[PDB]
Every structure is written in C-alpha cells, then in structure tokens.
Design a protein around this ligand. Structure first.
Ligand SMILES: N[C@@H](CCc1ccccc1)P(=O)(O)O
Ligand SMILES: [Zn+2]
Length: 865
C-alpha cells in the first residue's frame, strides 16, 4: 500500500516546457493527443509518466517508443540527453466517468476536474505541481452539439470543417502545473460583463450556464467584480489576462475550482435569486467567487511544490476570502460565524482519529486532505501572522512573497520566511503551527495583587495519531479587563498604557504582568479568537453575565453566552441521568431575557447569541459518549427556552418583520433581520407546534423569498404533524424544476428529528429528482442523515447500517463522496460500548468489500486500526 511522505520529496528528473494538447470529441469517445517538450534535469533517468486513460500510442521524437505500462505509470528507459518530445494518444469515454475527476460528462456537456491528480486521467503526464509548463489546447467537436469550446487562456485561432465540426485553439501564456488545466465543451448560454483593472486594461468576464440557469448568475458576476476591485485595493494585486471565464456545473465533487482563467463552479456557488436562494446562499456565492478569484495570485501565480503544502494556497486563500467578506459587510458577525464553523467541524477532526497537521507529513490518498484542518485552521494560522504583524506588516510579507516566488512552486516554509524576513522578526517557533496537529489547551489563572493583574497561562497540546511530542507553540492571546460595571480598565504592558494588548505565550508556562490597575477586574481573554485554542479560565456565572452584557469584543461576548449554554446542557445531563426534574437555569434565563430585549444589539449578532452549541461541541473531550443523552439534554434546553419565552419570540419576530420592511432581495441589512426572524420561528414552533397550521394557512403570504420558505420549513421540520409532510411535498412540487432547491428538500428530509426519518429517507432515494450519482444530492439527503444525531446514532444500529450500506454503494462510482461520508463514523472510539460495537461492525463490513477504494480504505484504517 503506497504512502507518500513529505520527507521523501525530490525534485523531478524531467521538466515539461511545453504541453500541446489536441482533443477530438466524438460519440461516445474523445481521443486526446499530446506533444510534450521535455527537458532533462537528471540526464539518463527513466521517464516516468502518470496515467490511467486507455493508451493508444506513445512516441518519442516521432517514433514509436519502447515503453512499459504497469499500473498507472508509463516508463521509457531510453531517453535523449537533451530536449525531446513525447507524443501520447489516449482515449476517454467521458459519459462513463461517474467519479467526476478527469474529463466527464454532465447535463450533456463535458467538463474537467484536475485538482489534485485528475489530469493523469486524461493523458500521461508528469502530474505533480512542481512541474509547470506552458499549455496550448486544440479542441475539435460537432458544432451543433458542442458550440462552446473552452480551455485556459487566450483564444488564438479556430475554424470550421464541412462535415459539421468546428475547432478552437487556446493559448495560456503562463506556465502552470497540470492541476490547473481545464476544458469545457458544451451547449451553454453566456453572460458577459467586464472589469477595468487599475492599469486601465479591460478584462472581459464571461459566465457560462445552462440557458435556464442564466437569469440566476447576476449576483455572482457582481461579486466577481467586487473581488477584483478588492484584491487591487487591499492587496495591490491585479489580474493578468484580458479574459476571465466561469462555468457552472451541476455535477461536481466540491465547491469550485480556480483553473487559470477558466474557473469551474458547482451551481450552488454561482446561482441565486431571491425566490430560490437563501441569504446564506448569496453570502456563499460571494465568498466562493472571491475565493477562486483570489487563487489567481495565491495558488496560480505562486503554486505548491507538493501536495503536502496544500495549506500554502488554501489557508491563505480562505483567509483572503474571509477578509473580503468582512470588508464587504458585518465583519464581527462574519468572524464569529467562521469561529463557530471551526469549532464545530475542525475541532472534532483535531480530536479524532483522522487528525493531521496543517501540513501533513504523509498521505495515502491526497483527496482525503481537502479538510477543515488544511482550510479553516490553515486560515487561522495565516490570520495569526496578521495578528502578530499588523495589516501593514502582513502586506510587506505578501509583497516579499510575490517578489521572491512569482512563477514558482513553493512551501509553507517559504511563506513563513517571507513574513519573517519582510518584518525583520524571528518566526522559527511559528513553524510548529504547520507541523503539530491537535488543538492547544491553555490553562489560565489571574490574580490582582497590589495593582498588578498577574495572568498565569500554561499550554499543552495532546498527542495525535501521527505524533506524540508536542512542544510549546507561539500563541497570541489578546486581552482586556472589565471593572465591576463592565467598563474597560486601562493597564500597563509593556511600557504602554492601553485598554487591550496581545500577550504572546511562547513557553510551556508564563506569567504576564498587567500593571497600574486601580480597580477590581475580570479579564476578557482570547479576543477576536486570537489563536485557534481551547482556553480554560475559572469564570463564575456572574462573570460570564458581565462579559455578555458589557464586553466590547464580539467573540468574547458570544463565548460567554456559549459557556452559559454549555453549563446548562451539562446541568441537564446530570438531572436527566439522576431521574430528577430539570434545573431552573435561573441566571441563564435572565441573561437570555436581556439579549432578547436589548435593542442596541445588531440583529445578526443577537441571533448568534441565541444559538446553542451543537451536540459535538457539547461532547467534546468526553469518553463513552451516548449521543442520544447529549441530544436529549440539548433538546430540553431548547424546549425550555422555546416555552419560557414564547410570547417574546413572537414579539421579536414581529419587530424583525417590521424592520425588514418588505425588502426581500438580498442585502446584508435585510438578511440580518431575516436571520433573527428565523431564530424566532424555530423557537415558536418548538413551543407551539400547532402554530404550523396557522403558518400553513398564510404560507403564500409568508413565502416572500427562499430565506423565509427555508426558515419556516426548517422550523417545522421536526414537527410530528402531517402538515409538515404536506408542506415539504408542496415545496418539492413548487420547485421541482430547480435542482438547487431540490437539494434543500432532500436536506430537510435527511435532517428531520421526527421519528420516521429513516423510512422517509429511504423513500427519498427513489424520488424522481434524486440521483445518488450527483454529489449535491447525495450530500443533501445521505450526508444530512449521517449528521442527524438521533437517527444516525439510533441504538438499534439502523443508522450505522444505512450509512455503511451507502458508503459501499457510492464508493463503487465516487470514492471522494464515499470517503467524506464514512467520516460520519469518526466518533467510534469515543462511543459507549453498545454503539461502538455496532460502528466497528459497520466499518469492518466496509473494509471487507472487494475493490474498496484507497480513499475510503485510508479513512477506515485510521478509525479501526
Ligand atoms: N482548490 C479548490 C478545491 C479543489 C478541488 C475541487 C474538487 C475536487 C478536489 C479538489 P477550492 O478550494 O478553491 O475550492
Ligand atoms: Zn481553494
């Protein structure tokens, strides 16, 4: 079983200077011919090409090569000592490609996905990102069937043939790794716009969609134009071609893809209108359109040496996309959402069997490393450079990075060195953020003696499956102090008098002296979530209420609420387990009443303060978990809050509706009110499930956009009324023609806490609009069921069996989807014995499948072995 190790990296023996491709598209086969111009680096080594397409011929300088093909590699032993050409002819059946990697069909059109190692499914090549070549691509096809023929770069020639066929030739002048190749052939509608760069050069913008989806592309176009302007104003980065194309595709494994000048997007991240897309969907488009555009510099112009460096482009591009969205609107709310995402999804990963460093030391299947750790913790790591260095110094680091490395394939170490060198600071210890897996745990204690607040802080990082030794890391802790009435208190550190400071923890244990303090204080700690850590400080319930009411930092106010909810859930667990009455939660209820009633709180921030941590956050750190017990305790808390404040939930909803003021289109302002409104609806329908018939009666009047339909349907989705079933059926009939709205129906089916979800999910498998072979559908229905705690973790094992059956079925055509699904079982070692036994059986049965993919195999072994 091949494992790839970062320690074994060696530069390539061969470079590829020029890559000329010819695609001859027919029914059913596409024949690909290449001409590669190959430059020896280590003369006399065998030429080894990666590839898995059907091989029809290979030549070296025009003569039939003597070669051997074994597995997915082709080797030619007798190669010239100087420049030579290699010609390879392959044949592909793209309508049989259900993996959606390489060249594949979708909606009668043809698309590619090459990142990370898809290009070798098209031709034989040196398919690694430190090999950068200049591509020119010729495409020939039936004109009526394939009128749009695209590939990267500039379109330099084209023509017609008498038999109905036409051709185009695309030249991309920038050297690139093979993972950034793209090709599209299809009958697609175009939407045209343009942007004029800071140097006065127009860039033609073209979005390609189906003819029916074209009216939903306008928000994405405007978001691209905003991202282009923003890279220029914030980073001083300008686009480098006079054309930028984006192509939407309904069958796609991930969100989008930054192929140079020809980005390919999942429909879900480009199409929206207010009738069919929620405000969250719009925000997603804005983030992801920016994200892919930001890759032009952070990924394309500067690339990755090897796949272990994935976070070099993804952490930094996520950071860029986060900063773009925060500059657009609602910076603090958006930051909290990001933190919440990290703690809900990335913390469990770092605590579990598949935990890995931001820059892994080894992998079996690289597709398994497109993770919350590489992306979201990666962005947190980039952000720490910003926190340490300031915006100006961070920009000096970026400028040096591009001066040094424009045109190169580089490492996380190079980025770190650029940050360090541009600012004249030593960041050697900072490398541990790349190499050390696990969430650091800070233990802190504070004392005000004399007029010094002495904050003592210890750090530790647990062993993870790859590594036991974890040394002290460089951790910035941003702090403030509140007095007895919650106003800010100034303090001295280090020779500066201010109301905030970044305390830099670099050792196992340190004491920080905040001097010149004249009042009794409670510290505010880890402001802005200044490092991706767990922090334990002994706070009283009154201290948490003070922080929530009065602290000036969003994160720490929201963390205080989160802590109160968590403590209440813990209290419920205790009573439920003793068979006694539920706690009163008198202080939490009083804090919540304050939030509800506070009219100076931003609407969307208010909604976050009223969100209860998820079950996985609640069982973080526990052993012998019974997921249903945590679910029960959380549900009891939500029911308490729903019922206790029912009339005030109705009132808040009404104030929010009045303020929304019939502005149903997307804007950050209107969205905030809708978000609050949807929190109220959830609570109302908890407390008074009968209110569903009153909703049903006025449904048309309430259904003024998808944010409202989604919010209502979400609110009632766990209701045992038949009316919940009728509303869902009517939703599926109304939007039957919109694939992205059908994804939403399937998600409601899969996520319901009603007792009869498993059978409704089984029926939905056979819905005319469901397709197991479509990643958006599979994820919506099955993926949602796998995260549906009461159903997935049912005591009878029915959930585990179902999900294991679908890993097995899906893995037969799409290992990437199946390997993402099988991670539903990651909690295995931490479950109570009865459920653990059943999960282990499910995983052994997956492992016993003949021909199980490497992708799913790798994850099952981490869990089981
Ligand atoms: N680089 C892209 C992810 C690539 C990908 C797409 C599909 C399958 C595997 C990897 P993003 O992170 O810009 O979205
Ligand atoms: Zn990316």
């Amino acid at each position: 079983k091949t494992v790839h190790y970062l320690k074994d990296y060696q530069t390539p023996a061969y470079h590829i200077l020029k890559t000329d491709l010819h695609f001859d598209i027919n029914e059913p086969q596409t024949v690909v011919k290449s001409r590669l111009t190959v430059e020896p680096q280590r003369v006399g080594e065998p030429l080894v090409l990666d590839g898995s397409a059907k091989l029809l011929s290979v030549k070296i300088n025009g003569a039939a090569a003597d070669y051997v093909l074994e597995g997915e590699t082709l080797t030619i032993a007798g190669v010239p000592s100087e420049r030579f050409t290699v010609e390879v002819e392959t044949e592909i059946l793209p309508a049989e490609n259900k993996s959606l990697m390489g060249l594949y069909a979708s909606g009668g059109n043809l698309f590619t996905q090459c990142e990370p190692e898809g290009f070798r499914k098209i031709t034989f090549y040196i398919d690694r990102p430190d090999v950068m070549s200049k591509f020119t691509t010729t495409i020939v096809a039936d004109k009526k069937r394939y009128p749009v023929l695209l590939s990267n770069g500039n379109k330099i020639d084209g023509g017609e043939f008498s038999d109905g066929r036409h051709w185009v030739k695309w030249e991309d002048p920038f050297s690139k790794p093979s993972y950034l190749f793209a090709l599209v052939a299809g009958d697609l509608a175009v939407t045209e716009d343009y942007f004029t760069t800071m140097s006065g050069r127009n860039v033609k913008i073209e979005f390609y969609t189906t003819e029916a989806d074209k009216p939903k592309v306008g928000f994405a176009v405007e978001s691209l134009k905003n991202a282009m302007k923003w890279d220029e104003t914030r980073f001083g980065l300008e686009y480098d071609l006079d054309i930028f194309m984006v192509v939407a595709v309904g069958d796609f494994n991930m969100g989008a893809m930054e192929n140079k000048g020809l980005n390919i997007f999942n429909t879900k991240f480009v199409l929206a209108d207010s009738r069919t897309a929620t405000d969250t969907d719009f925000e997603g488009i804005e983030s992801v359109v920016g994200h892919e555009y930001f890759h032009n510099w952070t990924g394309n112009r500067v690339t990755c040496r090897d796949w272990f460096q994935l976070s070099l482009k993804e952490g930094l591009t996520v950071f860029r996309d986060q900063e773009f969205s925060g500059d657009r609107a609602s910076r603090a709310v958006r930051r909290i959402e990001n933190i919440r995402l990290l703690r809900q999804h990335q913390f469990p990963e770092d605590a579990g069997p598949t935990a890995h460093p931001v820059r892994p030391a080894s992998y079996e299947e690289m597709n398994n490393f497109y993770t919350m750790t590489v992306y979201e913790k990666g962005a947190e790591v980039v952000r720490m450079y910003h926190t340490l260095l300031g915006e100006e110094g961070f920009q000096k680091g970026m400028k040096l990075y591009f001066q040094r490395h424009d045109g190169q394939a580089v490492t996380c170490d190079d980025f770190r060195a650029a940050m360090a060198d541009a600012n004249g600071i030593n960041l050697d210890q900072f490398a541990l953020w790349y190499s050390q897996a696990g969430t650091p745990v800070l233990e802190a204690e504070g004392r005000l003696k004399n007029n010094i607040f002495e904050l003592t802080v210890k750090q530790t990082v647990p062993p993870t499956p790859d590594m036991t030794d974890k040394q002290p890391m460089m951790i910035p802790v941003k702090v403030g102090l509140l007095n007895r009435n919650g106003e800010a208190v100034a303090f001295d550190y280090q020779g500066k008098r201010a109301t905030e400071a970044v305390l830099l923890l670099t050792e196992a244990e340190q004491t920080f002296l905040l001097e010149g303090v004249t009042e009794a204080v409670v510290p505010s700690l880890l402001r802005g979530f200044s490092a991706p850590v767990h922090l334990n400080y002994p706070y009283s319930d009154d201290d948490l209420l003070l922080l929530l009411a009065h602290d000036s930092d969003a994160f720490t106010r929201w963390e205080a609420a989160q802590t109160l909810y968590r403590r209440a859930v813990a209290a419920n667990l205790a009573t439920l387990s003793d068979g006694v009455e539920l706690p009163k939660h008198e202080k939490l209820l009083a804090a919540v009443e304050k939030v509800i009633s506070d009219d100076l709180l931003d609407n969307a921030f208010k909604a976050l303060l009223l969100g209860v941590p998820s079950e996985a956050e609640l069982w973080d750190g526990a052993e012998n978990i019974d997921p249903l017990r945590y679910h029960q305790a959380r549900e009891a808390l939500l029911d308490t809050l729903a019922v206790h404040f029912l009339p005030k939930w109705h009132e808040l909803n009404r104030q929010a509706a009045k303020q929304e003021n019939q502005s149903y289109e997307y804007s950050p302002e209107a969205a905030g009110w809708r978000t609050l409104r949807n929190v109220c609806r959830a609570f109302v329908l908890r407390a008074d499930p009968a209110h569903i018939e009153t909703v049903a009666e006025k449904y048309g009047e309430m259904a003024q956009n998808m944010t409202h339909e989604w919010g209502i349907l979400s609110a009632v989705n766990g209701n045992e009324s038949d009316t919940r079933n009728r509303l869902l059926a009517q939703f599926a009939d109304k939007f039957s023609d919109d694939a992205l709205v059908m994804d939403k129906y399937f998600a409601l089916v899969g996520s319901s806490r009603r007792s009869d979800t498993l059978q409704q999910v089984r029926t939905a498998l056979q819905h005319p609009k469901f397709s197991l072979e479509n990643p958006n559908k599979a994820r919506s229905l099955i993926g949602s069921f796998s995260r549906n705690v009461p159903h997935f973790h049912a005591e009878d094992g029915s959930g585990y069996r179902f999900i294991a059956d679908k890993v097995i079925e899906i893995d037969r055509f799409n290992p990437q989807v199946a390997a993402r699904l099988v991670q539903a079982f990651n909690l295995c070692n931490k479950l109570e014995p009865h459920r653990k036994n059943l999960v282990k059986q499910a995983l052994q049965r997956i492992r016993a499948q003949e021909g199980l993919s490497k992708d799913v195999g790798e994850i099952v072994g981490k869990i089981l072995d």
